[PDB]
């Protein structure tokens, strides 16, 4: 209870979600579905 800050947890989850969305947007320009 309160060992790791909740704002720190939410911030780390936010960077992970932003990075996952960045990978998803980068994959639209490479590989399958890249129109090339």
Kindly list the residues in this chain that would bind ligand DGD in the complex (CB under 6 A): 25, 29
* 10 is a site residue for another protein (CB under 8 A): yes
2: left (phi over 0), alpha (psi -120 to 50) or beta: left
32: left (phi over 0), alpha (psi -120 to 50) or beta: beta
Which is closer to ligand DGD, CB of 7 or CB of 25?
25
* 26 is a site residue for another protein (CB under 8 A): yes
CB of 32 to another protein, least distance (A): 3
Helical H segments across the chain, by residue range: 6-26
Q: Tell me which residues in 1-36 interact with ligand BCR (CB under 6 A).
A: 17, 21
């Amino acid at each position: 209870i309160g060992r790791i800050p909740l704002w720190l947890v939410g911030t780390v989850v936010g960077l992970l979600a932003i990075g996952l969305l960045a990978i998803f947007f980068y994959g639209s320009y490479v590989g399958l579905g890249s129109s090339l």
